[PDB]
Amino acid sequence: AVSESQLKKMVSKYKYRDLTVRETVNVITLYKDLKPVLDSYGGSRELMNLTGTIPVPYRGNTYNIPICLWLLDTYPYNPPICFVKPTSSMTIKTGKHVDANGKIYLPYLHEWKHPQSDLLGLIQVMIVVFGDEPPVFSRP
């Protein structure tokens, strides 16, 4: 697992460090398949993101939907940039909440406002919305 000490190091360049670490811990504690990763966003600059899967029930079954939540250095004042990350055995379902690049669009992200908006609330919304319209489907 990851420690708060290691997280603080990862967000050293962030404007609101304690707040970002606090929510990250909350998220990875509840969602065991999400992992904090420090990587180059779009190959432009380094940012920490939460990568992995979240459990989403659809038509009676639960799926481990692969996602990636990029936390900007302005987190939590600005919402995260989120993507669905299909494996080779699946395809991105472009639609109301997902564009051609797998980027996620949600009213929750659009009107994001700290402190009423947070990652736990966002993920809860994803589970509900994706449970209605999956962002990815498996190849036949």
């Binding site: 065991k32 038509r59 799926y63 481990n64 699946m90 395809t91 990815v136 498996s138």
Partner: peptide, 9 residues
């Protein structure tokens, strides 16, 4: 956990 997705409909 391994990434999974519902079958194409």
């Amino acid at each position: 956990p391994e990434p999974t997705a519902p079958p194409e409909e």
